[PDB]
Amino acid sequence: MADCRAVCSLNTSDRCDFVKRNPDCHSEGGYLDYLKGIFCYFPPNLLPLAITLYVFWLLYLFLILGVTAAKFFCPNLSAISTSLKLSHNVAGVTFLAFGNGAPDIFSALVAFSDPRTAGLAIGALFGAGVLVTTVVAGGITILRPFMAASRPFLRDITFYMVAVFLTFTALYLGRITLVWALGYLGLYVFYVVTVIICTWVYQRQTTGQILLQALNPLDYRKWRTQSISCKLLKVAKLPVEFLLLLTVPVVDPDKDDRNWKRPLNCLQLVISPLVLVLTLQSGVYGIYEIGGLLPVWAVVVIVGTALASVTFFATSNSEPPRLHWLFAFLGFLTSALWINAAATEVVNILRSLGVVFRLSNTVLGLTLLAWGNSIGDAFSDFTLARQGYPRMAFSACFGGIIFNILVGVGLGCLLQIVRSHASEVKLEPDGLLVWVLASALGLSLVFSLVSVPLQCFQLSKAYGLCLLLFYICFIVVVLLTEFGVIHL
């Protein structure tokens, strides 16, 4: 079996045959075969343009990963928590971190699902830790100087340092066991409990019109008021939320009617199970045929329409049903699944590029995937800082990364152990570069660990500028390392 990477070394007349014949050049998950499109569907003379197109497509995927994370997933989780009566301070501390880090967890899980992309997963995590800590955080200090809380900052930086050192020693060991993932999850739950306890101690011391309006994502007044760039962003974004409202239910506890749309939701009780079945595991469960006569999707649709009719005739348009909260549960699950699908696509695209340009997995993980996953963090944090809440944004800038690393690594490793029935996940370090990446992350923390206390916790513009220059130097070192300029 010849390796996929040799494809660029063969004649153009045999590229299609080699791609079609090599099991390695086939991806186990996804809807599109990108390598086939690169080497068979398009002529070789148009090879560069196609790659550019892919990049554009890749960017669009990340946009989806933003919207589903911000407008449907996070509000559904917030409604679920409000059903459990959680405090506002805990919400401000955590929910933004969950909303910003869900794409990171799903991308890491998809990457760890296959050994060949395993090196991508770590490259997705540490690189993000290098970015959000250096650029985004620094950006906040540039936009609005403020005074940072001492004790929460020290706690967050200590927990992040502990997590980073644990992952460093795990990488040095070259393997991840089941007990290690369980310890990661236990450490995260310990951190959450510690945050709760410390906060407590500190505090103590016609139907057609409603469907047309609900399915309309264009607020005409706001769209008219916005500038040209915002108009372009909104028009580019319209199909994504159109599909999302169409398929994903959202429950908002802040609304007196709880976003009750009786016929829209009655249609959704049929739509959501169908998309769930047809999308789970790339639809493999969808075409499974029961007893050799009836496919699953047909009986799923029948049960869904029966339930929708029962609910529609059993409820009224004025008063939401007593079981309205269960909708959010559905509005949770499918939403997460949607993100998963998008995540898978992104990973596949990156792998394809690794075949074409003969690039290492770590370089792709720390450059493209990190930026794509952190664009949502950057937008949310900059918006929060500009609106007059820099303390919350800066606190989240360190709170979310710990949750990202711990939950992503632990859950991905746990699911890989459970699914493959293997006792261990093998981490193969892709040469020297990975070590450099880890080193960079640690150094950044050290800078903060010295810079913030030395300023008496009054963060200024120079701190952000220095962090930005540090990130530029880090990218300089990475670029030198990749192209083989420095080599043992």
Alpha helices for 288-323 (secondary structure H): 296-314
Spatial CB neighbours of 407, under 8 Å, sequence gap ≥ 6: 101, 105, 185, 188
Which span (21-29, 375-383, 384-392, 417-425) binds Ca ion, by CB under 5 A?
375-383
Kindly tell me which of 194 and 458 has the beta carbon lying closer to a copy of itself.
458
310 lies in the site for a copy of itself, by CB under 8 A: no
DSSP string, 418-458: HHH--SEEE----TTHHHHHHHHHHHHHHHHHHHHHHTTTE
> Of the listed pieces 203-211, 236-244, 318-326, 443-451, which binds a copy of itself according to CB under 8 A?
443-451
Q: How far is the CB of 209 from Ca ion (least distance, A)?
A: 38
Q: Which does 100 bind (CB under 5 to 8 A by kind): Ca ion, a copy of itself, none?
A: Ca ion
Q: Which amino acid is at 190?
A: F
Residue 488 binds to a copy of itself (criterion: CB under 8 A): yes
Q: In the bound complex, what is the minimum distance in angstroms from residue 135's beta carbon to a copy of itself? A: 8
DSSP 184-228: HHHHHHHHHHHHHHHHHHHHH--HHHHHHHHT----HHHHHHS-H
Complete DSSP assignment for 12-81: GGGHHHHHHH-GGGS-SS-S--HHHIIIIIS-GGGHHHHHHHHHHHHHHHHHHHHHIIIIIIHHHHHHHH
Q: From CA 354, how far away is CA 459, in angstroms rounded?
A: 40
Q: Could you give the string, one character per residue 29-68, with x where binding to a copy of itself holds by CB under 8 A and - elsewhere? A: ----------------------------------------
Report the nearest approach of a copy of itself to the CB of residue 435 (Å). Answer: 9
CB of 175 to a copy of itself, least distance (A): 20
Residues in the chain: 488
Kindly indicate which of the ranges 222-230, 297-305, 333-341, 466-474 contains the residues binding a copy of itself, using the contact rule CB under 8 A.
466-474
- 320 binding partner (options a copy of itself, Ca ion, none; Cβ < 5 to 8 Å by kind): none
Is 373 among the residues that bind Ca ion (CB under 5 A)? yes
**Nearest alpha carbon to residue 160 among 391, 434, 403:** 403
Name 285's Cβ contacts closer than 8 Å, sequence gap at least 6.
277, 296
Residue 454 lies near a copy of itself (rule: CB under 8 A):
yes
Does 293 help bind a copy of itself (rule: CB under 8 A)?
A: no
DSSP class of 360: -
Amino acid code (one letter) for 173: L
Number of residues that bind a copy of itself (CB under 8 A): 35
CB of 186 to a copy of itself, least distance (A): 22
Q: What are the Cα distances from residue 80, in Å, to 251, 252, 328?
A: 9, 10, 7
Q: How far is CA 3 from CA 23, 348, 358, 382, 441, in A?
A: 10, 17, 12, 44, 33
Distance of closest approach, residue 49 Cβ to Ca ion, in angstroms: 30
Q: Are 76 and 254 in contact (CB under 8 A)?
A: no
Assess 439 for contact with a copy of itself (CB under 8 A).
yes
Q: Which stretch binds a copy of itself (CB under 8 A): 209-217, 290-298, 399-407, 451-459?
A: 451-459
Those residues with Cβ within 8 angstroms of residue 484's Cβ, 6 or more apart along the chain or in another chain: none
- A 10 A CB-CB count for 455 gives 14
Counting contacts by CB under 8 A, is residue 443 touching a copy of itself? yes
Site for a copy of itself in 467-486 (CB under 8 A): 468-470, 472-473, 475-477, 479-480, 484-486
- In DSSP terms, which residues pair with 289 in a beta bridge? 295
Helix (H, G, I), strand (E, B) or coil at 176: strand
The site partner of 18 among Ca ion, a copy of itself, none (C-beta below 5 to 8 Å per kind) is none
Which residue number, 364 or 436, has a Cβ lying nearer to a copy of itself?
A: 436
Contacts of a copy of itself in 131-190 (CB under 8 A): 139, 142-143
457: contact with a copy of itself by CB under 8 A: no
Is the four-CA dihedral 474, 476, 481, 483 of positive or negative sign? positive
Task: Compose the 94-133 pattern: x for residues touching Ca ion by CB under 5 A, - for all others.
Answer: ------x---x-----------------------------
Binders in 62-101 for Ca ion, by CB under 5 A: 100
Residues that bind a copy of itself (CB under 8 A): 139, 142-143, 432, 439, 443, 446-447, 450-451, 454-456, 460-466, 468-470, 472-473, 475-477, 479-480, 484-488
